[PDB]
Every structure is written in structure tokens, then in C-alpha cells.
Structure 1
């Protein structure tokens, strides 16, 4: 199937004066907001609500300093808000920021038995904040064992009769929690659908939110244009017709990983890699013969233009483009003097390809390995180790030590990869089955444990839950590396959750792309 965008994003001219107009007013709105944070004499509930709203509006990235300092004090000053609402929110914010706040704060809301007091089933704002908090738990938070089921069942019961926009905020939460959703996608929904219709809205913050979102969108649109040009200048739609045309979608993913303007170069470098490996994938999946794929795999491992001759003409195209890309990366990084870090991404790509070849081998033989062995190859084929490594390329502050840490397959990274694999397998199962892919995960899980499809998918679901608790734990201080390098990994897992919601294709991404890159927010 072809791209349904056309050349809609191929050309974008920024309204220079509009940008300056917005940028100038934002600085003023930025200062007003800062003073709202640096403000003195505020209740706990009010301070946490301020932080939460600024974050949901997608503007918190301007007050990384301010918000941190405030949450730090709250952590240290351990409060006693007998309000479920403020407690759950206090818990979530701190946890999301790496503050290992004790889950004992919830015991006051549950009986001797250790279960949530059902007397709270009429505190909708409490249930909602508890619901959101339930997704930020780790393995040491069994006190929150049934917080999801509890808050969920009562919110569903309450929802139909709630006033707007609360009703829509709740209904949306039940379909997509905040912690596991894509930042820009959730920010878009909050600004446009909730806060804008909020009667108690703060006009300074709402205007600040809309202007910023729209200004960043102009930046994103410029980037997607440069990329759409770069992709067009390669012309893989006529030269390599078996490969998918999804550069726009590949950009949405780079955007899910990070949206900040400071990560402009990284995001562009990333989208290029995602698009490139997207071709290599289709090369192993739809086209290419066994004999052909081994030569491709082999050439990638050697990594030298001298190997092109050994490859069929069509694989010569892909292969040459791959080295040029990494050649382009080294040049961009030359200025900063970080040109050397490119090798890390390269070594990961080889790993993906090496495993792509293995995947096809298993397909031909009709091999159905045990889960242990299956995952030993299937994890890298998610490309997440490769994408996460690529993430650091454009991040001007990423050091050799950071790449060093990442190369050891840290648990947070490992968990992100597992979520991707597991979710993908549950969704694409029924499809790949009919294609003769008896090498799929759910198939291996059924043959290994001697269980049905449901049980297998259930076992996989638990693997993703375990994986999320691990990501949440991996964010707690002291973090192995700066949070700056953990977020991309966190975002990769969120993208998976967002793409395979309810485990269909670009039909799921279309609305997000329109709301994020096509339509601007009406002021």
C-alpha cells in the first residue's frame, strides 16, 4: 500500500513574522508562569495541581529546574493529605520524576485487609488520580495491587453522568492512561479537548500552551519537509517498489521519542535511521531470496563499499544508501567533535540484520523454537536496541560512557524491547500465522508451554506488565545515567502502546499525525 499523504509535507515555508510574534509573547508568558511556580504560600494540593497542569499542557520543559526543586522539597517534607486525590497525584508526580516516595501513603485509604475502602467509590477525582498513579508502580508496590481494577470499575460506573470536560477526561483515561501515552499526543488532547473547555482554566497557561504547541509544530513541519525531500532525493518508490512508503509515520515515531527543539538534529538523524531500517526489514520480509539475504547480511557485517559488487543490483541501492547515511552522520557530528560515536549505532544495525537473517532461516525450515530461544533473536528484531542507540546520536550531551552503559543492555532498555516484542506478537499473530510464519512468538509460547492462544497472549501480557514495572523502577534515583537518556527509552515503550492500541496499521497513526503535524490548535 502507498503513502496516503502525497507531497502534503514535502514543502513547508515558515511564516517568519508569525514565529517571531509567538516567540516574543511566549517569553512573557514563560516569565509569568515561572513566577506562578516560584510563588510562595501555596497549599500542597495547589502546588501539585499547578505542576500537573503545566505538564499536561506540554510546557513543563521550560521549567525543568523549577519543577524539580519543588518536587524535591515535597519528597523530603513527607506530607499527610488524607485526601486520596492529592495523595495519588503526589505519588505519581514524584515517582515519574525518580523520587522513590513510599507507597505506604495509600494504606490510610485501605482497610486492615489491605484493600481499598469502597467508601471512596464516590470520589471521582480521587479515583482518577489513583487510576493514573496505578500505572507508575514497580515490583515493590504490591499495596497498589488492585488500584487499577478498583479505580477502573468505579470510573466506568461514574463516567456517564459526569459534567464536561471531566467526563471526557475520564473516558479518555480509561482508553489511554497518561504515563504510557505519547507526550505530544496527550498534550494535544489535553489543551484542545479538556483545558480549553475547562471553566476554571487559567488563561495565562492556556494561551502559553496553545502558542508553544503551535510554534513547535512549525519546527516539526520544517523537519518533516527536509526529511521528505531527503527521502524523495533517494527515490526508493520506483527503484525499490517492494519497500513501504511510510516516511511520515517514521517521523511520528522520532517525534514520540522527543519533541523539544533542542533535540532537533537528533530527531532528524533518528527518522532517517527508522526509514532506512524499514527498507532492510521489507528486504527480508517480502522480497529477497535465501541466497540473496545471506550476501546482504554478510556485506553489512564487513561494512565496506568494496562489497557492493557481490550484491544483486537492487540490494546495491539499499546498501550504498546505508553507508552514505552513516557517512552523513559522521559529518554532522564532526563540528561538535563527536563523530566517533557513530560506530555504536552501526554495531547495533549489524545485530538487527544478523537477526533478520536468522528469522528468515527459521521461516524456511518451518522451525518453532522454545520461547527462551525465540526471544534470544526476536528481541533485537524489534530494532529497539538499535533505535535507542540512534537516539543518543543527536543528543549533544551524550558521552562515550552513556553509550557504554547502553551497550550492556541495561534493564530499562531490555524492558522497553520486551514490551515492543510482546505487544507486536499479540497484535500481528493471527496475521503472520496465515503467512506461514510459525516462528512467531505466540506460536512458540503455545508449543513450549503446551497452552492455547489465549493463555499464551495472557502470558505475554504479564511480560509487558513486568516490563513496565521495570521501566518505572529504572527511572528511580540514583539513575544509572542522566534522566535525559532514559526518557527516550521510556518514550519508545509508549510509542508501542500507542501504535498497537487494542491488540490495525497506519489507521491508528493517522489521527495523531493530523493533530500533531497537519492541524494547528485554534486560538
Structure 2
């Protein structure tokens, strides 16, 4: 006897299946972008700029989503600003300097906020009528670490006054403030925040710089072309696996999986990485569904064993349908090895394989606890449930397509560094707070909130409050993990940071398909009108 399928069909049909990129328009865009890019570079390399104007320029280029073209230029400017350690006198410039520096790994001291607080460490209420300062303070309060307790009340302070000011602000500032209160910049998905800023804010800004705006629109639309080409290629690959018919119990969400990948990295250089990553996200959702709503204890046990052994000769020990999954998985990793041969990086593939074996083991433990009706103490729950987030696997997989990723980087990641663990915790805690009721109605007595309630002997509310504090602790750890000197290149930390952002954005409110729908349309269907 099998469970009631239910689930939901892909509401996207096949609108993404084929996309012909007319080079005529792409060539034109590429060509003007080159020119706008240099005009912009020259804007950055201009001498005699005041601090406030320099920070505003960088902040604008970053929000417009084109800063990836100026990594070096922006780095040198912030480095110089860091070392000049000048201390501006207004909240607005000080909070922006603090945020941009910290987001880039420069450990600027939070003491720059002292002058804005009374004698007992609390922000002067007289600042309540400085909206731009409050907005930058608000954004800055989200990048703090455990060593920034002088900013412990910054979030509440700026939030209360911004909510009060918002209704009477001019546009588009009002829209920017309202958006910020719903979604801070530091914790949002990069392309999503960029799309909103370009068309809802900057495009409607009186003082907007026409060069940057045009640059931002053409770039966003040119990259969108690449993304649509990637998604078509992926939809075709997914269509040719035809799990939609052979494994009718599994979800069909290749589009939502691709979106996830787009959140990890959107830049053109990560094209191969994205295609490789989406295949694993899609493949793991199938493995998950198999353990979630179909496979029997006996089948799952054999399924886990086969995975641990990892040999196409083991397929005979599994029931018909699992032979489909199992072979696909083996082939996928064989394909990765093949794709990396050219560059001579096929040896790193095993790291991803180990994470796959690991999550399968934990999936099996998960169902065992379900069958038994076991409610483990939080400590034990987390030891197993962290991996079932899929995040150790996704993070490891995100490195496969990155040309610069070396063995040393994978070794660092294999030891579960603090930044990765923080990202994994955020995902676990957010999902557990959001999926508590549902899973509970299925008698899944081993859900995080339940374990926490029984363990500490507290109410569901108190349990969720404790889990929120864990996510908060985790964000401070991620922020701290980005500070120089970093254990590996920042290029390898960003995907981990982005994974935490994606889950936060997906569960912004306690589905997730209709939460992602509008983002997918904005990033992959509709271009920004020039």
C-alpha cells in the first residue's frame, strides 16, 4: 500500500523548455555594456570624491547588481577607506561605511556608532527624524557579529521610527523603506533585491544616474538571457529523464530548483556550476520524496545500503522503481567527472558523493525514528537533521563547477566549518518553525520544535522562540565568518551565505511555491523594460 500522491503538477507547463537567444540583440547589449562598463569604471576611479559620495556610488552599483564587474576597483576603495579609518559625523554615512566594509570582510570597529548613543549605550532618540540615517542604520544592524553589542538595539530603534515615518515619505524612498522593513538587503537573494531596486526604486529616482541605470538594465536583461538558456537546457535534461511518468510520486520542480541555483550565484562565470548544481537539487528532491512518501522501511534500508556501496552492480538488489533513481544518481556523478575531465578536476567529485551517502544515511535514520515514534533530545535531533536540510550537499556541490575550487577548499568544507554549520542551522531552524504544524499532523513526533518542546519542557511558542535565537546566533556567525583573514577565498564563502539567504527569503512568512512564483517570473520570465 502506497501513500496518497497528492502533491502538485508543475504550473509552468513548458514555457521554459526552449529558448532561442537571438545573438543580434545579445551582441548589441554586450557591446553597449562594454562601453557603459568603462564609463562606470572611470566613475569609481575618480579622485577628489567625498566619503559620502564614494560610499553612495559603491552602494548604488552594488544594489544595481553590476558590482561583479568591479570587484578589484571596489575592493581597493573600501580598503583605502578602511585604513584611513576616518570617522564621519553623521549616522547615514557612518552606518553605510560600517555595512559596506563589514560585508566586504573589513572588520571596522562598531565604536563608530558611539557618538550616536547617549552615555549609557542607547541610540539618541533625537535621531528619529533622520530617515536616511535610520534606513542605513537599519540595514547595518543586520551585518553584526557577537562582538557588536553596541548595536544590540539598532534594529528595534530604526525599525520603530522607520515604520512611523514611512507613510509620509516621498517616492520612491517610501517604497524603499517599506521594502527594507519587509526584507533587509543583507539577508535577501541578490538577483531578487537587484530586480526590485532597478525597476521599483532607481528607475523612479529623480537624481538617478542615467548611465548606471541603463547599464544596470541591459546587464540584468543580458544575463537573464543566459539564465533562460541554462533553464531550457536543464528542463530538457529533466524532461529526458521522464521521472514525471516513471516516478509519479516525486515532485516536478526543476524550475524552482533552478531558481535556488540562481540564488547561489548569478554571474555568467558560474554558468557551468549552476547547471551542475541544479541537477543535484532536482535529484535529491527525488531521493527525499522516495523516503518521504513512498518507499517502505525494507526498501529504504536496501536503498541506503546500495548508496553506501555505490556500484551499478548493486542495482539488482533494489525494487524496480528504485533502480531508476539509483542509476540516475550514479550517472549524474559519472557525468560530473566527465565534465571536469577537460579541466582535470574529476577527482573533487567524490566529495559531493560522500555528502550524498551521508544525507541518505540520515534520511534512513529519519524514517526509522518516524516508524518508532521516537522523539530525540534536541542535541540528538540536530546531529541527524542538519544534514537532511540538504545544505552540506548543496554547498559541496556548488563548488564542482567553480574553476577556482581546489582540493584544499573541499577539505576545509569537509570538516563542517563554522560558517557552513551556521548556514545549515538557519535552514534547519527556519524550516522546522514553518513546517511544524504540517509534519505534526502526520504524527512526525521527531520534528525539531517537538523535540525542543519535550526536551526543555516548554510550550510550542517558547520552542520556536528558542529556535529563532539559534538562527540569530547563526547569522552573527556567518557575518563573523566573512571577516578577513578568511580560511578560504571569499568566492567560496558567498555560496554558503547565499544558501542562508535563499531559505530566509523562501520562508519569509509561514508555500514555498507561491512564494517563489513571483520571483521566478521577475528573474526568468519578464525582462526589465528599458
Q: Same fold (TM over 0.5)?
A: yes
Q: Distance in 2 between matches of 1:24 and 1:297?
A: 52
SS class of match (2:243): coil
Matched, 1:205 2:212: yes
Residue 163 of structure 1: how far off its partner (Å): 0.2
Residue 449 of structure 1: how far off its partner (Å): 0.3
Contact in 2 for aligned 1:195/1:201 (Cα 8 Å):
yes
Residue 366 of structure 1: how far off its partner (Å): 0.4
Contact in 2 for aligned 1:89/1:130 (Cα 8 Å):
yes
Q: Distance in 1 between matches of 2:232 and 2:412?
A: 34
SS class of match (1:238): helix
Matched, 1:76 2:83: yes
Residue 41 of structure 1: how far off its partner (Å): 0.4
Residue 319 of structure 1: how far off its partner (Å): 0.3
Residue 405 of structure 1: how far off its partner (Å): 0.5
Residue 504 of structure 1: how far off its partner (Å): 2.3
SS class of match (1:333): helix
Q: Distance in 2 between matches of 1:396 and 1:348?
A: 20
Q: Which 4+ runs in 1 deviate beyond 6 A?
A: none
SS class of match (2:21): coil
What are the ranges of 5 or more consecutive residues in structure 1 without an aligned counterpart? none
Residue 519 of structure 1: how far off its partner (Å): 0.2
After TM superposition, the structure 1 = structure 2 runs for residues 29-40 of structure 1, keeping only pairs within 5 Å, are 29-40=36-47
Matched, 1:398 2:409: no
2:520 aligns with one of 513, 519, 522:
513
Task: Please list the CA deviations of residues 1-56 of structure 1 after superposition, one character each: whole Å capped at 9, or x if unmatched.
Answer: 10000001000000111000000000000000000000010000000000000000
Contact in 2 for aligned 1:423/1:503 (Cα 8 Å):
no
Q: Distance in 2 between matches of 1:212 and 1:150?
A: 37
Q: Distance in 2 between matches of 1:385 and 1:273?
A: 12
Residue 371 of structure 1: how far off its partner (Å): 0.1
SS class of match (2:244): coil
What are the ranges of 5 or more consecutive residues in structure 2 without an aligned counterpart? 1-7
Matched residues, number:
523
Q: Distance in 2 between matches of 1:80 and 1:107?
A: 11
Q: Distance in 2 between matches of 1:325 and 1:505?
A: 27
Instruction: Give the structure 1 partner of residue 197 of structure 2.
Output: 190
Q: Distance in 2 between matches of 1:16 and 1:33?
A: 25
Task: Please list the CA deviations of residues 304-352 of structure 1 after superposition, one character each: whole Å capped at 9, or x if unmatched.
Answer: 0110010000000000000000011001000000011000000000000
Q: Distance in 1 between matches of 2:240 and 2:479?
A: 42
Instruction: Give the structure 2 partner of residue 486 of structure 1.
Output: 493
Residue 86 of structure 1: how far off its partner (Å): 0.2
TM-score, structure 1 as length reference: 1.00
Residue 482 of structure 1: how far off its partner (Å): 0.2
After TM superposition, the structure 1 = structure 2 runs for residues 310-459 of structure 1, keeping only pairs within 5 Å, are 310-459=317-466
Contact in 2 for aligned 1:138/1:470 (Cα 8 Å):
yes
Contact in 2 for aligned 1:475/1:483 (Cα 8 Å):
yes
Q: Distance in 2 between matches of 1:336 and 1:405?
A: 21
Q: Distance in 2 between matches of 1:436 and 1:8?
A: 38
Q: Distance in 1 between matches of 2:432 and 2:199?
A: 34
Q: Distance in 1 between matches of 2:208 and 2:362?
A: 52
Task: Please list the CA deviations of residues 69-102 of structure 1 after superposition, one character each: whole Å capped at 9, or x if unmatched.
Answer: 0000000001121110000000000000000000
TM-score, structure 2 as length reference: 0.98
Q: Distance in 2 between matches of 1:247 and 1:72?
A: 41
Q: Distance in 2 between matches of 1:17 and 1:485?
A: 35
Contact in 2 for aligned 1:56/1:186 (Cα 8 Å):
yes
SS class of match (2:247): coil
Q: Distance in 2 between matches of 1:79 and 1:511?
A: 42
Q: Distance in 2 between matches of 1:11 and 1:286?
A: 32
Q: Distance in 1 between matches of 2:22 and 2:446?
A: 51
Q: Distance in 1 between matches of 2:66 and 2:115?
A: 34
Residue 503 of structure 1: how far off its partner (Å): 3.3
Q: Distance in 1 between matches of 2:189 and 2:102?
A: 18
SS class of match (2:356): helix
Task: Please list the CA deviations of residues 167-198 of structure 1 after superposition, one character each: whole Å capped at 9, or x if unmatched.
Answer: 00000000000000000000000000000000
Residue 502 of structure 1: how far off its partner (Å): 1.8
Q: Distance in 2 between matches of 1:78 and 1:38?
A: 20
Task: Please list the CA deviations of residues 139-162 of structure 1 after superposition, one character each: whole Å capped at 9, or x if unmatched.
Answer: 000000000000000000000000
Q: Distance in 2 between matches of 1:212 and 1:246?
A: 27
Root mean square deviation, CA, Å:
0.4
Task: Please list the CA deviations of residues 258-280 of structure 1 after superposition, one character each: whole Å capped at 9, or x if unmatched.
Answer: 00000000000000000000000
Task: Please list the CA deviations of residues 437-464 of structure 1 after superposition, one character each: whole Å capped at 9, or x if unmatched.
Answer: 0010000000000000000000000000
Q: Distance in 2 between matches of 1:348 and 1:261?
A: 27
Instruction: Give the structure 1 partner of residue 102 of structure 2.
Output: 95
Q: Distance in 2 between matches of 1:381 and 1:266?
A: 22
Q: Distance in 1 between matches of 2:42 and 2:512?
A: 45
Q: Distance in 1 between matches of 2:10 and 2:182?
A: 28
Task: Please list the CA deviations of residues 183-235 of structure 1 after superposition, one character each: whole Å capped at 9, or x if unmatched.
Answer: 00000000000000000000000000000000000000000000000000000
Residue 129 of structure 1: how far off its partner (Å): 0.1
Instruction: Give the structure 2 partner of residue 43 of structure 1.
Output: 50
Q: Distance in 1 between matches of 2:88 and 2:108?
A: 14
Contact in 2 for aligned 1:138/1:472 (Cα 8 Å):
yes
Contact in 2 for aligned 1:295/1:311 (Cα 8 Å):
yes
Q: Distance in 1 between matches of 2:508 and 2:358?
A: 28
Contact in 2 for aligned 1:416/1:471 (Cα 8 Å):
yes
Residue 505 of structure 1: how far off its partner (Å): 2.0
Task: Please list the CA deviations of residues 381-440 of structure 1 after superposition, one character each: whole Å capped at 9, or x if unmatched.
Answer: 001001000010000000000001000100000000000000000000011000110010
